[PDB]
Amino acid sequence: ALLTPDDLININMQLQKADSAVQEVTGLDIKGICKALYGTFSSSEKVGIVPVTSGNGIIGNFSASLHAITQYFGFDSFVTDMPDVSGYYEAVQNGAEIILMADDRTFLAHNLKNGKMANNQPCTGIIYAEIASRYLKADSKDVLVVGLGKVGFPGAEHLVQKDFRVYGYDADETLLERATSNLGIIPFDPANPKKFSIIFEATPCANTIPEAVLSENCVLSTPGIPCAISEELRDKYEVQLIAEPLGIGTASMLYSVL
Numbered sequence: 001a002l003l004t005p006d007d008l009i010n011i012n013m014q015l016q017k018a019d020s021a022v023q024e025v026t027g028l029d030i031k032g033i034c035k036a037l038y039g040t041f042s043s044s045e046k047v048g049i050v051p052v053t054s055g056n057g058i059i060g061n062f063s064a065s066l067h068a069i070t071q072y073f074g075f076d077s078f079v080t081d082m083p084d085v086s087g088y089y090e091a092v093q094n095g096a097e098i099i100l101m102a103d104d105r106t107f108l109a110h111n112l113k114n115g116k117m118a119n120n121q122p123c124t125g126i127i128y129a130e131i132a133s134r135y136l137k138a139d140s141k142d143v144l145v146v147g148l149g150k151v152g153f154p155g156a157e158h159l160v161q162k163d164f165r166v167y168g169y170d171a172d173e174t175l176l177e178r179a180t181s182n183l184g185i186i187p188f189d190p191a192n193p194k195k196f197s198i199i200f201e202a203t204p205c206a207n208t209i210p211e212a213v214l215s216e217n218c219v220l221s222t223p224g225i226p227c228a229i230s231e232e233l234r235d236k237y238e239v240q241l242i243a244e245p246l247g248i249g250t251a252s253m254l255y256s257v258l
């Protein structure tokens with residue numbers, strides 16, 4: 001579904017904790033990961049955030065959180081007073097170089113200076129898949145991808161391009177076939193589980209990661225909401241959790257259009 005205000009409470013602490021976890025797992029902070037993916041770094045580019053009333057409308061804490069996220073990664077960001085088209089105009093007129101705005105189906109970053117444009121879905125799948133894959137103590141190039149939709153598919157695509165051995169599952173058999181037929185990934189059978197130390201999950205569902213596939217100290221990299229693994233299992237296998245509701249995906253978008 002959609003983000004709620006409650007998901008975005010204390011976004012600064014959520015981002016701090018996510019950054020620490022990415023550092024622990026991969027040896028790089030989120031800036032470092034983006035640098036590896038896109039070769040870019042921030043130089044205080046001016047970023048206009050435009051609230052949008054379309055569909056379900058303005059989500060409490062959404063623009064405020066993007067404002068914090070952008071500032072956190074060193075951008076010169078602002079949120080427009082007006083929403084929608086009037087907000088867009090305001091943003092361009094106040095000198096935005098990059099526009100950031102979302103409706104219920106599309107969240108984008110558009111860099112007006114160089115024409116590059118990012119969609120949040122593939123940009124999130126890519127960065128979370130990248131983070132998972134750079135797990136320093138992995139000891140294997142096998143990775144399990146659970147969820148092969150708009151976030152998951154591009155994530156798996158990235159891992160295949162990066163020369164990882166990708167096993168894929170989606171509860172929707174048509175989506176699983178599309179992935180094996182277009183990407184050439186290996187289909188994972190829940191009934192014949194093997195342990196993974198690298199796991200990437202991209203679903204809107206809880207408890208999608210069976211106990212049988214967790215190895216001790218494995219990384220679980222998931223944009224998904226709610227959380228893919230119960231607290232109990234996460235504690236029991238000392239699982240290294242990378243999960244954060246907006247900022248890591250947002251960083252991936254911004255750095256990709258620089």
Ligand SMILES: NC(=O)c1ccc[n+]([C@@H]2O[C@H](COP(=O)([O-])OP(=O)(O)OC[C@H]3O[C@@H](n4cnc5c(N)ncnc54)[C@H](O)[C@@H]3O)[C@@H](O)[C@H]2O)c1
Pocket residue numbers: 001002120121124146147148149150151152169170171172175202203204205207208222223224225226244245246247248249250
């Ligand atoms: N943290 C972030 O910044 C961020 C950014 C974008 C999206 N998301 C979240 O990521 C999640 C997925 O996004 P999406 O757009 O790819 O959704 P999607 O609907 O395009 O794909 C989700 C897939 O998960 C599959 N699925 C559901 N239950 C499953 C199960 N038990 N086992 C295996 N697969 C299962 C579905 O069949 C579906 O194909 C959503 O919760 C979304 O809110 C988070």
Ligand SMILES: NCCC[C@@H](N)C(=O)NCCC[C@H](N)C(=O)O
Pocket residue numbers: 001002003050051052053054057058059060062063102103104105106107120121
């Ligand atoms: N990436 C796909 C998942 C859903 C996405 N399009 C979204 O979060 N919409 C957010 C809507 C923001 C709202 N219009 C606002 O400006 O507050």
Ligand SMILES: [Mg+2]
Pocket residue numbers: 124223244245246247248249250
């Ligand atoms: Mg995120």
Ligand code: NA
Pocket residue numbers: 201202203204205206207208222224225226227228
């Ligand atoms: Na989930």
